[PDB]
């Protein structure tokens, strides 16, 4: 009962932590998706500014 | 024993799933991290190309 209870408190805590890791990994997926998109948008802007600088050049 | 064994297999399944929520979220953030590294590297290369175009300008 204890082998399972212990395995459970550990599986359950590991779950809360895996769920937390998932929460954080997902928070990071979302925070990075935001950041990736921000760098993609800023990249498009750098590329547009580059096309502009190159046309001005 | 069954209550703990079941709660355990469920904590373990939830754990494997949460680990996969995290692994998939990790795969996604990792994909995104690769994208931020590549896009941000291009942001900076575009920004550097831009700085170059602007300096040349």
Number of strands of chain A: 0
Task: From the alpha carbons, calculate the radius of gyration of chain A and give it in angstroms.
Answer: 23 Å
**Could you state the oligomeric state of the chains shown?**
part of a larger assembly
Straight-line distance between termini of chain A: 77 Å
Report on the biggest sheet of chain A: none
Helix fraction of chain A by DSSP (H/I, runs of at least 4) = over 70%
The chain pair with the largest interface is: A-B, 34 and 34 residues
Could you state the order of secondary-structure elements of chain A as H and E?
Answer: H
Q: Bin the strand percentage of chain A.
A: under 5%
Tell me the overall shape of chain A. rod-shaped
**What is the overall number of helices of chain A?**
1
PDB class: contractile protein
Keywords: actin, tropomyosin, troponin, TF, contractile protein
Entry title: Structure of cardiac native thin filament at pCa=5.8 having upper troponin in Ca2+ bound state and lower troponin in Ca2+ free state
Chains A, B: Tropomyosin alpha-1 chain
List the helices and strands and how they pair.
The structure is cut from a larger assembly and holds 2 copies of chain A (57 residues).
Chain A: H1 2-56
PDB class: contractile protein
Keywords: actin, tropomyosin, troponin, TF, contractile protein
Entry title: Structure of cardiac native thin filament at pCa=5.8 having upper troponin in Ca2+ bound state and lower troponin in Ca2+ free state
Question: Could you explain how this protein is built, in words?
Answer:
This is part of a larger assembly, with two copies of chain A (57 residues). Chain A has 57 residues and is mainly alpha-helical. Helices cover 96% and strands 0% of the residues of chain A. Chain A has one helix and no strands. Chain A has one helix at 2-56. The termini of chain A are far apart.
